[PDB]
Design a protein around this ligand. Structure first.
Ligand SMILES: Nc1nc2c(ncn2[C@@H]2O[C@H](COP(=O)(O)CP(=O)(O)OP(=O)(O)O)[C@@H](O)[C@H]2O)c(=O)[nH]1
Ligand SMILES: Nc1nc2c(ncn2[C@@H]2O[C@H](COP(=O)(O)CP(=O)(O)OP(=O)(O)O)[C@@H](O)[C@H]2O)c(=O)[nH]1
Ligand SMILES: Nc1nc2c(ncn2[C@@H]2O[C@H](COP(=O)(O)OP(=O)(O)OP(=O)(O)O)[C@@H](O)[C@H]2O)c(=O)[nH]1
Ligand SMILES: Nc1nc2c(ncn2[C@@H]2O[C@H](COP(=O)(O)OP(=O)(O)OP(=O)(O)O)[C@@H](O)[C@H]2O)c(=O)[nH]1
Ligand SMILES: [Mg+2]
Ligand SMILES: [Mg+2]
Ligand SMILES: [Mg+2]
Ligand SMILES: [Mg+2]
Lengths: 430, 427, 430, 427
């Protein structure tokens, strides 16, 4: 039982999803044709004899990205009806995604999802992959999330989001889309892991010694985090964390559901031989700003809860030691209303590595998911960016053309202001 | 799936159009007969964007060829690739327009245009989901300018929700080949302002400069000039035709580049561009391409970008490239050249990447800049118009075709308003 | 446990360090690739299986010297992150080292050091190798020492310094750098071993019969001294001296922490066969001016304390005899406030010799570390040199350009004057 | 990592520059096509100091070639190694400067210089961390002197924190080939005093003496003379290009050799130098090299070092050598020749050693001396200037280019002040 349904929305979502599915296949020994020469059932349905099918739906409003999947290496892995494509994209326009273009495809995707969900007997919930900046990733996902929330209700929804960078931004209208999607994300998502491409790039250059990291490098890394999250369901070890468990531990208030993920160790084959990558070391490395997946300063924020998810050759005692050490480090401060802020998971399976990947094979790894006030800084910069453009009503007409109202923008901004304020409040000591 | 309908009006439009078609067929592995002889499956995947599939493994351009003179048509048909075009898609008059916008817009062109409309309707019907139209022409003559504008108006009326793109070659005073150019340009510019969604301002002067200064070409021909334009045209729609890492089609580009409806006049650029001798002493790398593209000497409009500000730039990269590198180079350009970018649009640069490079190159770049400096181009034209109009010189001809003075007054006013608007956002 | 962290700063520091690491490897049987086909742990961390990594950081502001290490024989010994290099050197300018250029690299090096130190469970302290004359060796080291003093506090810092010669000086501005570094060295260093290239050259020509000794010859010799100092930690014998112990014995007053090191016997293969190198003999040779590592006259100074560190086939009784003999020698005078001025260490391991080295293999060796007033003479000559140049403000403008103030120079000179005076005072009998 | 940007201005500058490039390519194992065909990995390690890496295993000099005449450019391009240079790095006028500093500095040169500036900016951008600039030219003509000086000023304005080095060939009265040399030299010297950080005073007379007396060369050519200069140039930057035992780059040398800002005029020397017949009767050893270097007959400036005092000497040794031996020989020279060294700078000698010797030799030495005797060179020039200026001879030409008499007065004053300053420290 214990199934998780994956939804991959827009280009970014699709591409991350590809990586994820490559990784899952390798982890469960499933070949690209669905054949496997048990726990894999959390990610795969099984049909007849020698066939396994991902519990996933891939959606884009344009055909190009999905068309690659159809033509490509994993064409036999997915059945055609799980790869859903329209004709025209949302053109970096939230309105087109949520209304004009999205209203044509949403019903169909929902129906397919329902069909998929009917096949699963112990649904844990949904993993939703999408960008904040694109018209489909924002507008469509927002719409989809609403519908899912309506139909399914109390099912857990976890969204992995490529949040836009401070500096390294690829589109002009990104801040608008980001603001608009955030509003909906607040009410319909149970936990949201924001990720920043710039941070990933820095990590790849600094930690992996890669001169020129491309999206394929990012995606692979991202997939690893997802694997760590779901390894507790797909294998078993000494200490286990379910999704509901995770939510209980990591989320102190309903709105404050934005943990930062960080993975350790991220090292090269040659660089790793010399390093003595102990449990204590990797744990320590988790709480350092340079290895973060979002650009921001934890030293200027406060921790409310951290989940530490260990995998491979790890025993409780040394994890405890590491936690103790972390406690005594003055530069890592936790809020006073959380006397112990550590949920700990330990799983026996070492991280498996993708052939031709950038990361070296290690005996132990860790994924830390931590709710820190520091993430509010990202929102502040994004809000600032939004405010400039809106001051001149720049590009606004486009959105209006596709049925959006100006009042929605203001509403969205207000919502984000309120959220930032909430985050500020929880921070302060009594 | 996202078909583009191509229209060529007047001599210039036709010739550039021909060049465009030639390059595109080569790109998609189509030979002079319409048969696919390419290597890669990617060449045929999105062949339907520009080609209709005919019986017996042949492909035909979704192209309409329009002129008031049949000579141009003959020249096209007799060219290399002339036989690929649908015979029924050549829509020609017999008389010509005599460099008179009024003849093209109200008289001869009016009589002609219904046939063209009939053709284009059919072409639209044929395509499963037409995303829009690309018109190639000039603003300085009579056919391309008057007839072309008229055609645009007609098209938009019937397809108000489709994308309307033009590659418009503007008259410059240095390379001034005609007398009434100012009039024709002024009249057409006005019409373009209301009915096109994006307009690529191509300037012959700039092309010549590119050819002489950058390409080191002792004797450029119109063909050579046309080639540059064709390259640029190919660049814009690369994302529609091939796979990629980050994809932007015609709509996505417009939405990111046009913050206000009227401001849709682009200064295009293409990189790389090298002499035959100077090819061996260069680096095939993204920083170099970036460097080339933002340079004033590589813009295809005779405007100094340093005399205005960039509202937006869209950069389209072709070849296998690092996204990180692209992002760093684009951020660097905006940080270093802060003063040439409007401060109320953060991240003035939009990036798109297609994995398939053009033939002969491992990497290439196409630049679309929306600069307030384009006002220079309009201002000169306005001045020239004034110089003539103040004395009502050559007006009688236009009035003989049914035009009134008042139209001239209107057009001039409109252009001036446009210029003012650009200045406003420049600050 | 009992680890020592080595820091090698600038060209001189790097080159000495290379020699040192060659010697350590040979001593512990570690191959140039880190493999060893226990006590070695004092100098090496151990990773996984068949790998040992030096507890060292190599720093230079220019890439050239470190680049050799990366390309060279011991490229696999060090992990890349322990070899730290900037782009532009300090150009024999203290200011550039301490401020302009040094401020760009210091944080990074500190971070790495902290990482290294976290891996060690019984940190004894730091061994810092650098020149007094170079802009990096002076300015950078001074800065680094301050930071280390701040961060770590009561950890022992021992600096081995190539102090400039009276005659044989290679740069013009040496006296400035030397004076400036000395000021900081006073407050932040616990013990400083000054060494003079001219003296080493003389030794090589006279004692080793080498016509033309180069830096490689000096460095090898220097490394031996370091080995003698740390052999008490890296092996065990009849009588043992820890670093704290050493400090307690050798340092009578906080500022008076400048012992002179001398090594015996330094002999050729052929010349040694004839000599009957007894414990008494070598001990006697230690207290002779010709075998000193700094050019100066002990006959004109007074001894305050001497540590004698013996190694190899040595027994206490004969050491005692030697000490007694030394006591009765009128030409070797000790201050009246020290009735016994001998700390004695005896270690069982004979000195191991580097293949292709200048020194012959002996059954016994000794390293004497003695605090004598005679070293003050070096400071006097250096001060004199400084005073001439400063009289004309020669070269001063350069330093000012890089943010140094003229008042600092004067301050530094004053500090050295005070130090010389202090040294004078301790000398005099009551 | 520490790139040097090379500039060549006027005929002399170009020709010496060419020689320099030829030697350096040989040293780094680069052939006439730009391809690396060397043996050792050390030859490529720091190749980026002088060469940009182009596509397809080729290296191109970071060199800018400047002249008001295109003949020089043609000569360079047609030379052995002419094809290695970037075609776009040749920046040439058509007219020439007619031995007129004013034409080079204010008129023709002014018009020219912006192109040069554009090139050099690009060249700076290309390099990851440019340490500075090396300009080769003469002070006696119009281009190298006037245009060169102008270029220097421009460069320093844009790169005030970078090292500015010149190899300046000065006019001597023995080998006086032109009439207005005194004027051109005076005007340029003044400018150099304020804007260059180190200036190598190269004298044709001294070169001839070296060739005739030391090299025993019956018929020296300018090429032969140029070779010497090239060797010296190579010597200074050996520490940037190769490994070594004690390393000093351009900055380290300046800091040790320049005690006061204005006193940055070096008398260079190179050792060893032998005839073909007299080569077999010599010792390849450090004491011999040292002996050669400090000799007055081996200095490349027509000044007797025994007529002044050394403020500082920097000695750069190439080859496998004993440091002790070097230190002893340098101390010996200062102790024995005490009277020729200023007494208020103890250890007047700075030493640097690079393990890689030049081709054909096992050991070599380059000497840079800052001697108060250089005043002799300036004094002669001043005298000659006075001789002409007192009668205002040839002034009219300069005034026709916009120059005023007052500038002449200023320059002369400045030079005199410089001379006085040197005398002061000589004592
Ligand atoms: N870049 C190019 N410019 C061209 C080309 N052919 C013409 N032109 C330029 O365009 C202007 C002449 O325009 P046309 O021949 O197109 C006028 P058209 O035939 O459209 O209408 P008529 O008034 O009926 O002749 C002028 O500036 C020419 O110098 C071409 O192939 N390439
Ligand atoms: N050592 C060398 N001296 C040279 C060389 N060529 C010329 N000269 C000397 O330099 C002086 C002539 O200088 P130039 O030809 O460089 C004058 P330039 O071309 O820079 O400006 P114009 O006045 O525009 O000709 C004179 O003393 C020549 O005898 C050379 O290759 N080597
Ligand atoms: N990390 C990562 N980010 C991506 C990837 N692909 C796109 N992005 C980012 O996603 C944002 C662009 O959104 P897309 O996902 O391409 O757009 P979309 O969801 O397809 O929306 P439309 O194309 O406008 O319909 C930018 O911030 C890109 O940098 C990827 O593979 N990995
Ligand atoms: N004993 C010894 N002395 C050295 C060695 N290398 C350099 N020196 C001495 O160190 C001093 C020069 O300082 P360096 O270490 O080269 O300079 P640096 O620390 O690199 O400083 P900058 O190069 O100015 O940034 C001189 O007194 C040299 O004689 C060596 O290998 N052994
Ligand atoms: Mg998309
Ligand atoms: Mg025509
Ligand atoms: Mg150094
Ligand atoms: Mg000339």
């Amino acid at each position: 039982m214990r199934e998780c349904i994956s939804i991959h929305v827009g280009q970014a979502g699709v591409q991350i999803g590809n990586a994820c599915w490559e990784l899952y296949c390798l982890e469960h020994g499933i070949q690209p044709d669905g054949q496997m020469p048990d726990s894999f059932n959390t990610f795969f349905s099984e049909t007849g004899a020698g066939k396994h099918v991902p519990r996933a739906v891939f959606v884009d409003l344009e055909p190009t990205v999905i068309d690659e999947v159809r033509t490509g290496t994993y064409r036999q892995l997915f059945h055609p009806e799980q790869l859903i494509t329209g004709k025209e994209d949302a053109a970096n326009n939230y309105a087109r995604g949520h209304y004009t273009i999205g209203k044509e495809i949403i019903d169909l995707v929902l129906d397919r999802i329902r069909k998929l969900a009917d096949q699963c007997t112990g649904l844990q919930g949904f993993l939703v992959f999408h960008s904040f900046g694109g018209g489909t990733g924002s507008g469509f996902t927002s719409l989809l999330m609403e519908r899912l929330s309506v139909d399914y209700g109390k099912k857990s929804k976890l969204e992995f989001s490529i949040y836009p960078a401070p500096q390294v931004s690829t589109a002009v209208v990104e801040p608008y889309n980001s603001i608009l999607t955030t509003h909906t994300t607040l009410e319909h998502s149970d936990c949201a892991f924001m990720v920043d491409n710039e941070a990933i790039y820095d990590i790849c250059r600094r930690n992996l010694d890669i001169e020129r990291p491309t999206y394929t490098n990012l995606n692979r890394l991202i997939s690893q985090i997802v694997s760590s999250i779901t390894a507790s369901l797909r294998f078993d070890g000494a200490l286990n964390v379910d999704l509901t468990e995770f939510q209980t531990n990591l989320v102190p208030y309903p709105r404050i559901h934005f943990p930062l993920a960080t993975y350790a160790p991220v090292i090269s084959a040659e660089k790793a031989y010399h390093e003595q990558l102990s449990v204590a070391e990797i744990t320590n490395a988790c709480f350092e700003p340079a290895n973060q997946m979002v650009k921001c300063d934890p030293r200027h924020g406060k921790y409310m809860a951290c989940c530490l998810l260990y995998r491979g050759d790890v025993v409780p005692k040394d994890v405890n030691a590491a936690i103790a050490t972390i406690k005594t480090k003055r530069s890592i401060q936790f809020v006073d209303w959380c006397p112990t802020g550590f949920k700990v998971g330990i799983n026996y399976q070492p991280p498996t590595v993708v052939p031709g990947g950038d990361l070296a094979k290690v005996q132990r790894a860790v994924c830390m998911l931590s709710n820190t006030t520091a993430i509010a800084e990202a929102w502040a910069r994004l809000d600032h960016k939004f405010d400039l453009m809106y001051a001149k009503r720049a590009f606004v007409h486009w959105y209006v053309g596709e049925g959006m109202e100006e009042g929605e923008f203001s509403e969205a901004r207000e919502d984000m202001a309120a959220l930032e304020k909430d985050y500020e409040e929880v921070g302060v000591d009594s | 799936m996202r078909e583009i309908v191509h229209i060529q009006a007047g001599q210039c439009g036709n010739q550039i159009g021909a060049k465009f078609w030639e390059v595109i067929s080569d790109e998609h592995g189509i030979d002079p007969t319409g048969s696919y002889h390419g290597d890669s499956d990617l060449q045929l995947e999105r062949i339907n964007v520009y080609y209709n599939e005919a019986a017996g493994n042949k492909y035909v351009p979704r192209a309409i060829l329009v002129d008031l003179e049949p000579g141009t048509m003959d020249s096209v048909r007799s060219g290399p690739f002339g036989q690929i075009f649908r015979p029924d898609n050549f829509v020609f008059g017999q008389s010509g327009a005599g460099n008179n916008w009024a003849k093209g817009h109200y008289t001869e062109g009016a009589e002609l245009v219904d046939s063209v409309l009939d053709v284009v309707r059919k072409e639209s019907e044929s395509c499963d989901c037409l995303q829009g139209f690309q018109l190639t022409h000039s603003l300085g003559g009579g056919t391309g300018s008057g007839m072309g504008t008229l055609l645009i108006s007609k098209i938009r009326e019937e397809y108000p929700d489709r994308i309307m793109n033009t590659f418009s070659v503007v008259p410059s005073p240095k390379v001034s080949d005609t007398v009434v150019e100012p009039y024709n340009a002024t009249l057409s510019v006005h019409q373009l302002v209301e009915n096109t969604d994006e307009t690529y301002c191509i300037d012959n002067e700039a092309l010549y400069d590119i050819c002489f200064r950058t390409l080191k070409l002792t004797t450029p021909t119109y063909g050579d000039l046309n080639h540059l334009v064709s390259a640029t045209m190919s660049g814009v729609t690369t994302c529609l035709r091939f796979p990629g890492q980050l994809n932007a089609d015609l709509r996505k580009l417009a939405v990111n580049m046009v913050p206000f409806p009227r401001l849709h006049f682009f200064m295009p650029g293409f990189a790389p561009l090298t002499s035959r001798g100077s090819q061996q002493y260069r680096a095939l790398t993204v920083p170099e391409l970036t460097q080339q593209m933002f340079d004033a000497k590589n813009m295809m409009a005779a405007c100094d970008p340093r005399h205005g500000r960039y509202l937006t730039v869209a950069a389209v990269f072709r070849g296998r490239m690092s996204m990180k590198e692209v992002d760093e180079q684009m951020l660097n350009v905006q940080n270093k050249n802060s003063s040439y970018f409007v401060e109320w649009i953060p991240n003035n640069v939009k990036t798109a990447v297609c994995d398939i490079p053009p033939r002969g190159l491992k990497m290439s770049a196409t630049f679309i800049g929306n600069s307030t400096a384009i006002q220079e181009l309009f201002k000169r034209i306005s001045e020239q118009f004034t110089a003539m109009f103040r004395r009502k010189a050559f007006l009688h001809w236009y009035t003989g075709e049914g035009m009134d003075e008042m139209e001239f007054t209107e057009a001039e006013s409109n252009m001036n308003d446009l210029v003012s608007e650009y200045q406003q956002y420049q600050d």
